[PDB]
């Protein structure tokens, strides 16, 4: 109880001093709440939804409705802001399902994300997957980049910290995917290339952590994933809104949230 008070108080100090809102949920492998803050406030998902998108892809591979080596052809029309891998593979004319999903997860490649959306049936199909795994809250309404517009008050393209943390737990620990697909997506999250300065920078160096970042217009900076501490597994979702901070300061904010989480877990 005193440790939960310290957690709440320390997040609220960051919120006040940074003029920010911090949504956090930490859950155990079964989705039981360890701690949280603003945990049922809706926040724009930004690129965090690309982890659930990859889970959907793996579920279709597991079920036989998709193949990982299927070649997805495209032209320059599919290049959107921040498409590093899609741009490199453009001359060849395609990316495979698995190349696109790995680029979506580990580089946050937006063109690769839209290529997968085209293949799985668009935002409506992403939202149906959330519902299938018991998430009645998360919703994808648009493709990249407009799904990240983060207009104040807009419920499109949002989740809550608690819904998303429980979705992470279901995918990683709840048997949603084969052991093969679960291990592959977990290793992708550990090897994510875009999270070195966000949540994992605030965790002890010996914790196994994997995560997916997001950045939205209007000050959105998010990080969702899993960590293993003291032989316990956790799923975590952090959504923040800090319109007046710089990009680097928002990275520091999420890392500070990681430190506050660490202090709770250690205590």
Swiss-Prot record:
Keyword Signal attached: yes
Annotated active site: 47 (nucleophile)
Annotated effect of mutating residue 81 to K: Increases catalytic efficiency about 25-fold, with respect to ceftazidime. Increases resistance to ceftazidime about 30-fold, and to aztreonam about 20-fold, in DH5alpha E.coli strain
Lineage, top ranks: Bacteria, Pseudomonadati, Pseudomonadota, Gammaproteobacteria, Enterobacterales
Family: Belongs to the class-A beta-lactamase family.
NCBIfam families (alphabetical): bla_class_A, blaGES
InterPro entries linked: Beta-lactam/transpept-like, Beta-lactam_cat, Beta-lactam_class-A
Iron recorded as keyword: no
UniProt superkingdom: Bacteria
Enzymatic class: hydrolase
Catalytic activity: a beta-lactam + H2O = a substituted beta-amino acid
Protein name: Beta-lactamase GES-1
